[PDB]
UniProtKB/Swiss-Prot annotation:
One of its GO terms (molecular function) is zinc ion binding. Binds 2 Zn(2+) ions per subunit. Its cofactor is Zn(2+). The gene is blaNDM-1. The chain holds residues 42 to 270 of 270 of the full protein. This is Metallo-beta-lactamase type 2.
């Protein structure tokens, strides 16, 4: 079920995996939900994406302390927009090591974000260069190509059926891809397909702006991105 904790919502997805959800009144769009992940790996916790704000991100850390009560070893954030990186200062205040695509860190100042402390780089095939993601445990980080933004990255969780598409993937009944001012309209469709191909056995697709869905989310996104080229 949806566990309400202050203004945030937490949902367990697997024995060691939870979805965090936070909301921001974005004028003209309503109160917009954004999802990220919390993963327990043995005696430590790994976070995927901040909440929209520092205060909300501190509340994620409070929930972790209450429900898991293990240290947060690292966080990885999936592109330089507010829903994914808006709470970076809260993670830094807590002493948590932070990681993002090198390009997200480069873009962070102009997008209004604080950069992560460490930069990920990626091989030509999209998989993270392993030395840039040390001690990531079950998190498998993949750059699918430019799409929702130039810098968007995705994360699979080893030992589960879960892959996280962030804001690249929309649910199987979404009817648009949202704002495309930062989107790569030429390459969006290929990038969405590359994410599905990188995590071929993931049956639960977690995304930023819809509840978890089947693999039909990936093909519907790619179909709609076909219409931007
Ligand atoms: C702050 C987020 C970063 S993805 C954002 O800008 N959006 C999400 C919610 C709807 C509007 C807009 C979009 O259509 O992409
Ligand atoms: Zn975005
Ligand atoms: Zn988003």
């Amino acid at each position: 079920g949806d566990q309400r904790f202050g203004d945030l919502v937490f949902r367990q997805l697997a024995p060691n995996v939870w979805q965090h959800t936070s909301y921001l009144d974005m004028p003209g769009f309503g109160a917009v939900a954004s999802n990220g992940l919390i993963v327990r790996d043995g005696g430590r916790v790994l976070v995927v994406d901040t909440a929209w704000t520092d205060d909300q991100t501190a509340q994620i850390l409070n929930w972790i302390k209450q429900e898991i009560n293990l240290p947060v070893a690292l966080a990885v954030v999936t592109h330089a927009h507010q829903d994914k990186m808006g709470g970076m200062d809260a993670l830094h205040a807590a002493g948590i090591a932070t990681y993002a695509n090198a390009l997200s860190n480069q873009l962070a100042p102009q997008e209004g974000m604080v950069a992560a402390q460490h930069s990920l780089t990626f091989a030509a095939n999209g998989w993270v260069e392993p030395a840039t993601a040390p001690n990531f445990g079950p998190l498998k980080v993949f750059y699918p190509g430019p799409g929702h933004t130039s810098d968007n990255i995705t994360v699979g969780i080893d030992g589960t059926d879960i892959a996280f598409g962030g804001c690249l993937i929309k649910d199987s009944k979404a009817k648009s891809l949202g704002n495309l001012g930062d989107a790569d309209t030429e390459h969006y469709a290929a990038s969405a397909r590359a994410f599905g191909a990188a995590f071929p056995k993931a049956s639960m697709i977690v995304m930023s702006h819809s509840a978890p869905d089947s693999r039909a989310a990936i093909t519907h996104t790619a179909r709609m991105a076909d219409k931007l080229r």
